[PDB]
Nucleic acid binder design. Structure first.
Lengths: 7, 23, 497, 214
DNA sequence: TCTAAGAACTCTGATGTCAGTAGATTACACT
DNA sequence: GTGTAATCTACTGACATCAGAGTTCTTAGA
């Protein structure tokens, strides 16, 4: 599942 | 009318005697 | 009846020796039966409805207390809200020594007259100022012909009790195991609204049943805005709401007097009794301090005015029963506003049930509350139990979570059991089958709390300690189930635990 | 988790100029990183952020060079976010009149992560490149970079001004070069580390969900 | 080699609500 | 002016409810 900017 | 209405506390519906698990 | 009217109830015992000191057995006593009744309905009414009124009166006694029409009657207690000192006044007259304690005071077996007794009670109800919803008298006499030997005595009573019923005071009766017989058809046939041992009604006054009983009242009223323009008024009612032990009132030790918690706010440096305007509200984020007024920490959290805005329709299957927010509340029409809107609501109810549908809405119960989202599920009444309405017809507000509410839960994967491991379980489960009913259980704490509170209140000997109904009765679970725990211990896991 | 984030932002001249139906690729990227910074500016996560600017008319880095390691400013070191960073992002940042290389900025930024990840704690790590593909470069260190992105355990997210369903031949060829780099990193999942400024402004619209365990 | 940050539950206190009561204010009105 | 309506707006008891504060437990822990 999403991470980084999508944390 | 009489059938469901308690004599201790009128208009309110009669409180049935607690129950629990019993098979 | 209307909301505010108190229940009001007066207890009126035959003090006559022929019943008062009398038994066929030794094991009860009609006066000791009536006094027990009066103490026991009265201890029910104390926990359950401190607002509703009781009185108690002895007729045919020899020393008197009345306003007027005095002869041979003693009002032990005028009409009042119920409490401890009244229960202690009745306690004094109970038992084998009690039936002598009463004799040293009011005196026993003298002649009496129901047309005067009914006069007295009438004056009593008159004398009180409150609005009364139900006005009821309870007869504790066994004297089935009430000494109507003079029929021109008795016609006074029957006319006077016509006048009781005509003034919308009611009257009610209990017969008390008179030796050899009692029959209402001789007399009392026209005083109440084939032959008896002792009343099947009287055991209901010994139920000792405890709860608050709080009458039908709205939570709020709202407008169901279908769009920018069409509105109907609906009520919002609380069918299920968790009860709490009542709020405790802080007291002064040395006198038991109540005392005022009297909080102030004081500057840490100086004598400033800071007013609400002197101080703001704040947060810390990113090592800087954000400042807002006592107006705007509640201008934030505004979105809408009190109403219900319609959001369109869904299948009832897609409203998944695993995610549940807070207790469901009822919706029911109110012609108090928006007259004839009941005509729209009723069609809306009827036709949703055909469509297998819910309405979705956004809901604000007040000004300065955020909208939640709520599914209006439609509802239908099971009157089949001789019009005992187990379920009122209308809508349920069922609330729906938002993203923030549905908390993350850890990783796990398995599909582990074999058909034998289900197959043995399918037996134990079918052996343990009973019928739950909503009212079949009671709160162990809140029920225990009242019994402790009574012991302290009356100065009883003991807390009644009545054991709860939530513990599994494990010996029955041993026997009904039987030994089949071994099927798990043998067929499903190793012997190491 | 305690994360590393490194915004690696192209501030060359060219991204100031655009297809007239949108905001400039410069200010689009500036808005994306604004709509991002706000999130952890409020949310109580333990995540360090850094800013690197490239296409800068000056240069500031631990690794300075004449042609490579140049037209780059390591504008903000790897620490928890704050309101002054958000103000500097929202109001301070300028396009340079010059141009620079994202492969250039990437090596500097990845070496800064190799400095910062030793003296204080982390679990997961990211690098984040924002550009119009006006970078001109030799295809130099790439196999060692992709190998080292595994050996340093840092994922790369890449951000662009146009769709993945009026753009220059230089933007088409640049994207096939970005695809080739993410195919080399991760294969079929690798292109899902690539985002348009369009879809991301259409996804970063809101503050975070409140993060809590049971 | 253990000391706070993060939970969790109950309880207390204010704000807003509804129904009902009754006072004072404000219209209405005198030929 | 003087006097009698009709009727708005208050206050209270009571009930729900958010918030806020007091209290015991897990992990990370010199």
């Amino acid at each position: 599942k999403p991470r980084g900017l999508f944390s | 009318r009489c059938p469901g209405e308690s004599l201790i506390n009128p208009g309110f519906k009669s409180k049935k005697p607690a129950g629990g698990v019993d098979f | 009846y209307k909301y505010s009217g108190r229940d009001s109830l007066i207890f009126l015992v035959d003090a006559s020796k022929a019943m008062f000191e009398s038994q066929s057995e030794d094991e009860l006593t009609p006066f000791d039966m009536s006094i027990q009744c009066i103490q026991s309905v009265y201890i029910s009414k104390i926990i359950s409805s401190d607002r509703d009124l009781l009185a108690v009166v002895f007729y045919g006694t020899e020393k008197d207390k009345n306003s007027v029409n005095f002869k041979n009657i003693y009002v032990l207690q005028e009409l009042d809200n119920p409490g401890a000192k009244r229960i202690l006044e009745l306690d004094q007259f109970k038992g084998q020594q009690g039936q002598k304690r009463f004799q040293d005071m009011m005196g026993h077996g003298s002649d009496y007259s129901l047309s005067e007794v009914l006069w007295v009670c009438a004056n009593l109800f008159s004398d009180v100022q409150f609005k009364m919803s139900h006005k009821r008298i309870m007869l504790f006499t066994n004297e089935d012909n009430p000494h109507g030997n003079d029929s021109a005595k008795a016609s006074r009573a029957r006319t006077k009790a016509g006048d009781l019923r005509d003034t919308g005071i009611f009257l009610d009766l209990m017969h008390l195991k008179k030796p050899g017989g009692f029959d209402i058809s001789l007399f009392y046939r026209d005083i109440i609204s084939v032959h008896f041992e002792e009343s099947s009604k009287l055991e209901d006054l010994l139920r000792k049943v405890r709860a608050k009983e709080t009458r039908k009242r709205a939570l709020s009223r709202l407008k169901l805005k279908l769009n920018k323009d069409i509105v109907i008024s609906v009520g919002i009612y609380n069918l299920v709401q968790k009860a709490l032990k009542p709020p405790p009132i802080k007291l002064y030790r040395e006198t038991n007097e109540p005392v005022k918690t009297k909080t102030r706010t004081f500057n840490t440096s100086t004598g400033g009794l800071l007013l609400p305007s002197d101080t703001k509200r704040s947060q810390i984020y990113g090592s800087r301090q954000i400042i807002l007024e006592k107006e705007e920490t509640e201008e934030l959290k505004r979105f809408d005015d009190p109403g219900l805005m319609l959001m369109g329709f869904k299948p009832l299957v897609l409203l998944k029963k695993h995610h549940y927010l807070r207790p469901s509340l009822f919706v029911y029409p109110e012609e108090s506003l928006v007259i004839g809107s009941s005509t729209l609501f009723s069609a809306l109810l009827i036709k949703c049930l055909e469509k297998e549908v819910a309405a979705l809405c956004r809901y604000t119960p007040r000004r300065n509350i955020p909208p939640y989202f709520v599914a209006l599920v439609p509802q239908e009444e099971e009157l089949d139990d001789q019009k005992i309405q187990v379920t009122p017809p209308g809508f349920q507000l069922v609330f729906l979570p938002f993203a923030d509410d549905k908390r993350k839960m850890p990783f796990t994967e398995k599909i582990m059991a074999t058909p034998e491991q289900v197959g043995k379980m399918k037996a134990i489960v079918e052996k343990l089958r009973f019928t739950y009913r909503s009212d079949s259980f009671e709160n162990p704490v809140l029920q225990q709390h009242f019994r402790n509170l009574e012991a302290l209140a009356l100065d009883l000997m003991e807390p009644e300690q009545a054991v709860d109904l939530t513990l599994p009765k494990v010996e029955a679970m041993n026997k009904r189930l039987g030994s089949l725990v071994d099927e798990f211990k043998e067929l499903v896991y190793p012997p190491d635990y | 988790n305690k994360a590393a984030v490194v915004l690696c932002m192209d501030v060359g001249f060219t991204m100031s100029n655009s297809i007239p139906g949108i905001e400039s690729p410069f200010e689009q990227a500036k808005k994306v990183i604004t709509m991002f910074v706000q999130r952890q500016v409020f949310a109580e996560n333990k995540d360090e952020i850094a800013l690197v600017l490239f296409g800068t008319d000056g240069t500031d880095n631990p690794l300075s060079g004449g042609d490579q390691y140049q037209n780059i400013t390591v504008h903000r070191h790897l620490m928890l976010p704050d309101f002054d960073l958000l103000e500097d992002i929202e109001s301070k940042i300028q396009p340079g009149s010059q141009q620079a290389d994202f492969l250039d900025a990437l090596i500097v930024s990845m070496d800064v992560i190799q400095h910062e990840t030793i003296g204080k704690k982390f679990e997961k790590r990211h690098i984040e490149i924002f550009t119009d593909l006006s970078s001109r470069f030799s295809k130099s260190q790439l196999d060692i970079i992709i190998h080292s992105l595994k050996k340093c355990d840092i994922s790369l997210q890449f951000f662009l001004p146009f769709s993945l369903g009026g753009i220059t031949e230089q933007q088409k060829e640049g994207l096939e070069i970005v695809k080739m780099v993410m195919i080399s990193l991760e294969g079929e999942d690798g292109l899902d580390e690539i985002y348009s400024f369009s879809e991301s402004l259409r996804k970063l619209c809101v503050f975070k969900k409140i993060e809590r365990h049971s």
